[PDB]
């Protein structure tokens, strides 16, 4: 089975792991900081997802250094993962256009 498709898959399992860990680490880092709202697992998960997809509505965000550090990792993972899929879709289109022409 083609590499680009393996990577895409990996990227997804990975992203999910990061989202989950991201949620846990965020709450762990944010609790103890007065005024912090990223302090319960369920919403933290919703937070990381909206962060990984880079949407970030602003209803939730870390205020501590480690929380933000966890945010960066999640942002980057989401961006890389989704970009890696786009890349897989390209290799797919490129590889098949070569077919519709012969090679």
């Amino acid at each position: 089975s083609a590499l680009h498709w393996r990577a895409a898959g990996a990227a997804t399992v990975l992203l999910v792991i990061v989202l989950l860990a991201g949620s846990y680490l965020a709450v762990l880092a944010e609790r103890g900081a007065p005024g912090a709202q990223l302090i319960t697992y369920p919403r933290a998960l919703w937070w990381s997802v909206q962060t990984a997809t880079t949407v970030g509505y602003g209803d939730l965000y870390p205020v501590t250094l480690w929380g933000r550090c966890v945010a960066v990792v999640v942002m980057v993972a989401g961006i890389t993962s989704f970009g890696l899929v786009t890349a897989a879709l390209a290799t797919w289109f490129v590889g098949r256009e070569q077919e519709r022409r012969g090679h």
Partner: antibody, heavy 118, light 108 residues
């Protein structure tokens, strides 16, 4: 079955320091936080601090004098609170509760009555 | 830190009547409010979580409502077993905080 067990009482001499216990049983998750609440006779509930066993970190209430030190023993499923140099002011009922990381205290221990006298 | 105001402090009501305790947050906390009951010498007992969600084992008699800064815990048809102290607690922002408490008192 009784999820949080705490010693009925503890006598402490002014200046001394007792270490309260709270052992849990039932479903225990990696997202669990054990809290400690202090209730002076006749008054209300005062949040003291929290700890996440699966990781060992603890946070405390800043509005008050920190007289507690939270710890947790993974294997025995027991959370501990070290109150030091107590005084009459520290005498009260100390409860421990379990919070599933979703913000509310599902279950509380029966609480430990702590009396600080000579 | 978020302040939870519970007034009146004491509530007097006749048996079977409907009753409501109020809890006001110093700032908007969504529905991250929870209610606890504590009878004479017992430990707190979770009544309502997240402002309106019910807990199992709690008389269908107890309901919650509110959002933002104003929350209400109602008891449709009060009865002797309801005589206790009621507290509210928020998990919107760290640290969790508690209300001053409201004592339910029945007039028989």
């Amino acid at each position: 079955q009784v999820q949080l067990q705490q010693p009925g009482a503890e006598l402490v001499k002014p200046g001394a320091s007792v270490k309260l216990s709270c052992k849990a049983s039932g479903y225990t998750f990696t997202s669990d936080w054990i809290h400690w609440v202090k209730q002076r006779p006749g008054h209300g509930l005062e949040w003291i601090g929290e700890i996440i066993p699966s990781y060992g970190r603890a946070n405390y209430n800043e509005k008050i004098q920190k007289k507690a030190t939270l710890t947790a023993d993974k294997s025995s499923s027991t959370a501990f609170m070290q109150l030091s140099s107590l005084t009459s002011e520290d005498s009260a009922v100390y409860y421990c509760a379990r919070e599933r990381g979703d913000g509310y205290f599902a279950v509380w221990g029966a609480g430990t009555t702590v009396t600080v006298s000579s | 830190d978020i302040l939870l105001t519970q007034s009146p402090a004491i509530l007097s009501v006749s048996p079977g009547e409907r009753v409501s305790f109020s809890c006001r947050a110093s700032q908007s906390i969504g529905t991250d409010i929870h209610w606890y009951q504590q009878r004479t010498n017992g430990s707190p007992r979770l009544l309502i979580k997240y402002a309106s969600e019910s807990i199992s084992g709690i008389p269908s008699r107890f309901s919650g409502s509110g959002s933002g800064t104003d929350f209400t815990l109602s008891i449709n048809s009060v009865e002797s077993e309801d005589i206790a102290n009621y507290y509210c607690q928020q998990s919107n922002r760290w640290p969790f905080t508690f209300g001053s408490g409201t004592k339910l008192e029945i007039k028989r």
